[PDB]
Amino acid sequence: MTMEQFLTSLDMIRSGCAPKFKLKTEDLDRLRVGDFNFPPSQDLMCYTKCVSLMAGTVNKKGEFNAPKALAQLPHLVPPEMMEMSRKSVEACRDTHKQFKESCERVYQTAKCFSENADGQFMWP
């Protein structure tokens, strides 16, 4: 995937998930630039789960699958973002073990990616 394809994919992924929830545009804008520094609603957390299910990086119980995520990266991010993503997969692989509820498990993992990111992080 090229950078141009990646940037557009963010909108396409959002379109498959956002209609299932009641979400604020301002909250989606913040996640889009990797700013997870605000309290999320349950709907926003479950949105992150929907996006991750589409990516194949989590199961329906919200358990993050690090080997599978590493294998999926070429279908998720451009070459330019691979190393940063590999680094965040490793740093954030066990975050889900601290939570029991599936949407929360995914949201906290995504928040960890955003915080561990050593470059710009973008969420669909």
Swiss-Prot record:
GO molecular function: dibutyl phthalate binding; diphenyl phthalate binding; odorant binding; pheromone binding
Gene Ontology process terms (BP): courtship behavior; olfactory behavior; response to ethanol; response to pheromone; sensory perception of smell
GO CC annotations on file: extracellular region
Organ and tissue specificity: Specifically expressed in chemosensory system in both males and females. Expressed in a subset of trichoid chemosensory sensilla located on the ventral-lateral surface of the third antennal segment. Secreted from non-neuronal support cells into the sensillum lymph that bathes the olfactory neurons within these sensilla.
Main location group: secreted
Keyword match Transmembrane: no
Keywords for the protein's UniProt record, in alphabetical order: Behavior, Disulfide bond, Olfaction, Pheromone response, Pheromone-binding, Secreted, Sensory transduction, Signal, Transport
Cystine pairs: 17-50, 46-103, 92-112
Subcellular location: Secreted
Residues the entry annotates as binding butan-1-ol: 52, 57
Signal as UniProt keyword: yes
Residues holding ethanol: 52, 57
Binding site for 1-propanol: 52, 57
Family: Belongs to the PBP/GOBP family.
Function: Odorant-binding protein required for olfactory behavior and for activity of pheromone-sensitive neurons. Binds to alcohols and mediates avoidance behavior to high concentrations of alcohols, the alcohol-binding possibly resulting in activation of receptors on T2B neurons, the activation of these receptors inhibiting these neurons. Acts in concert with Snmp and lush to capture cVA molecules on the surface of Or67d expressing olfactory dendrites and facilitate their transfer to the odorant-receptor Orco complex. Required for cVA response, probably by binding to VA.
Descriptive protein name: General odorant-binding protein lush
Lineage: Eukaryota, Metazoa, Ecdysozoa, Arthropoda, Hexapoda
Residue span relative to the full protein: 30 to 153 of 153
